[PDB]
Write a protein that binds this ligand. Structure first.
Ligand SMILES: O=C(O)C1=C(C(=O)Nc2sc3c(c2-c2nc(C4CC4)no2)CCC(F)(F)C3)COCC1
Ligand SMILES: [Cl-]
Length: 134
């Protein structure tokens, strides 16, 4: 066992707040914002040795990353940005930083009660997305 075990499983989106404005701040265009905002993704998190895999599955995109904590990787995001990403575990929170074109956004994933809470921030704009077990 590892501490990341509290994240493993299949999670379904149950609430979203401020996501459209977060996407505006990131630079997502209108049509992608509208279709992304309508999505009700599942998030599937698994661990195999040191490798963590996070899959986002929805109508109009399935996206998957695999990574080792603390080891930078190239990522193509659901909105088609090419970013450099690093994910670490800090005090029980998975912290995902994405860097591209002199910009940065941080995505935190935390277990709170029976929820997986995703907090997304860029400059001062935050969105909170709440998942429950599927
Ligand atoms: O995992 C999340 O809840 C989180 C995100 C998420 O779900 N984004 C989703 S799902 C999903 C889409 C996107 C999406 N994002 C973005 C920009 C904001 C990154 N552009 O498109 C597009 C296609 C789809 F509609 F078919 C399905 C995004 O960032 C934070 C955590
Ligand atoms: Cl770490």
């Amino acid at each position: 066992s590892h501490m990341c075990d509290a994240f493993v499983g299949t999670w379904k989106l149950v609430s979203s707040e401020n996501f459209d404005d977060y996407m505006k701040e990131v630079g997502v265009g209108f049509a992608t914002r509208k279709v992304a905002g309508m999505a009700k993704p599942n998030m599937i998190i698994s661990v195999n040795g040191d490798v963590i895999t996070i899959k986002s599955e929805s109508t109009f995109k399935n996206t998957e990353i695999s990574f080792i904590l603390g080891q930078e990787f190239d990522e193509v995001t659901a909105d088609d940005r090419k970013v450099k990403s690093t994910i670490t575990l800090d005090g029980g929170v998975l912290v995902h930083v994405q860097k591209w074109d002199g910009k940065s956004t941080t995505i935190k994933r935390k277990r709170e009660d029976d929820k997986l809470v995703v907090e997304c921030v860029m400059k001062g704009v935050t969105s909170t997305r709440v998942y429950e077990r599927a």
